[PDB]
Amino acid sequence: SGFRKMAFPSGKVEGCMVQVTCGTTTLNGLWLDDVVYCPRHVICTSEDMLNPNYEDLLIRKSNHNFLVQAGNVQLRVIGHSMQNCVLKLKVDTANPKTPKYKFVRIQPGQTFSVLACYNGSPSGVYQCAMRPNFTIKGSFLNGSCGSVGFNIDYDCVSFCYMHHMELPTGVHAGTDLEGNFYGPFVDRQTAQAAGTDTTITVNVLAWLYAAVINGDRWFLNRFTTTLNDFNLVAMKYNYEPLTQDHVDILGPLSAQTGIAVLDMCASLKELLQNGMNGRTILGSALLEDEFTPFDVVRQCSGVTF
């Protein structure tokens, strides 16, 4: 029993992390087979910030202008190209530690592990959710760009996020590994704002199931509601509408606990309207929305990789 913010084991990703330096600028890159992937803003200077002419900047660069190091050991760059907001540096050595991998684009509300890195060296690993406004609430400092997010699906590492920037509100934005931003963001320093964020309802419900599995059941009554009536309340509290597809995804947890999904919804409706009356759930005094239904199953059933 117990329930923690648990990330995927990071070893497979640690062996891919390198440092990329262009001029005065160093960030992290992902080294897979004979290609290193990193944010293309490594080739910028401050004159470039509002209107970087990336094609011009790259044309002026030769392979020797990129210093790639793997554990402080130089790798020779032999080719360079750009895909969307990611730079692809072909190196003359293939990474012998490349895991089976795929590049995926995740959906809002889904989670992933982030391996936070500085100068090609990992600092720590933590779990993030893609927020409905396409930011993440990460933990990133100067030097962290090029850090990646990933899930492990079987023995395949599915990379889904590469870190580019922090908004003034303290939240984070980045791309998939093909260089396409999540959300309405660009890698030009215009003033950019995220939409208002909402709470990920399906994840809150999954976390309430996690609490029940762990014996933390005080908020359960033999109440039930309809999907429409639940949604009428949810939207008053800035929660995403719950769809029948979401109800379906909660099946496995409903099956384990014997608590119908619309009964759990009636419990959540009561918590929103009446509060928690000083009580905690799974050690939290707030309703948590960064565990997916799969996260709860994975953790409450012991899946390995």
Ligand X SMILES: *[C@@H](CC(=O)OCC)[C@H](C[C@@H]1CCNC1=O)NC(=O)[C@H](Cc1ccc(F)cc1)NC(=O)[C@H](N)Cc1ccc(F)cc1
DSSP string of 229-242?
Answer: HHHHHHGGGTBPPP
Find out whether 39 and 96 touch, Cβ atoms under 8 Å: no
d(CA 180, CA 84): 6
Q: Is 279 in the site for a copy of itself (CB under 8 A)?
A: no
Residues numbered 74-133 forming contacts with a copy of itself, rule: CB under 8 A: 115-119, 121-128
Backbone torsions φ then ψ of 257, nearest 5 degrees:
-95, -20
Q: Is 246 a catalytic residue?
A: no
Structure tokens given for 156: 């395949």
150 is a site residue for a copy of itself (CB under 8 A)? no
- The CB-of-144 to ligand X minimum distance in angstroms stands at 5
Q: Which of 25, 74, 81, 284 binds a copy of itself (CB under 8 A)?
A: 284
Give yes or no for residue 221 binding a copy of itself (CB under 8 A). no
CA distances from 166 to 39, 180, 256 (A): 14, 16, 40
Identity of residue 228: N
Taking the least distance from each CB to a copy of itself, the nearer of 60 and 137 is: 137
Nearer Cβ to ligand X (49/94): 49
Are residues 140 and 155 in contact, defined by beta-carbon separation less than 8 angstroms? no
Q: Return the H-helix or E-strand segment holding 54.
A: helix 54-59
* Interacting span for ligand X (CB under 6 A) from 64-72, 153-161, 167-175, 291-299: 167-175
Residue in 167, 220, 233, 282 binding ligand X, rule: CB under 6 A: 167
Token digits of residue 128: 């993030």
Active-site residue, 41 included: yes
145 binds, options a copy of itself, ligand X, none, Cβ within 5 to 8 A by partner type: ligand X
C-alpha to C-alpha distances, 186 to 54, 85, 282, nearest whole angstrom: 13, 9, 38
- Cβ neighbours for 207, distance < 8 A, ≥ 6 positions apart: 281, 282, 287, 288, 289, 291, 296
- Contact between 305 and a copy of itself (CB under 8 A)? yes
Kindly identify the residues of this chain, within the stretch 46-75, that bind ligand X according to CB under 6 A.
Answer: 49
Which span (77-85, 168-176, 226-234, 256-264) binds a copy of itself, by CB under 8 A? 168-176
Instruction: Establish if 14 lies at the interface with a copy of itself (CB under 8 A).
Output: yes
Q: How far is the CB of 174 from a copy of itself (least distance, A)?
A: 13
Candidate segments 91-99, 187-195, 269-277, 280-288, binder of ligand X by CB under 6 A: 187-195
What residue is closest to ligand X based on CB? 145
Q: Which residues are known catalytic residues? A: 41, 145
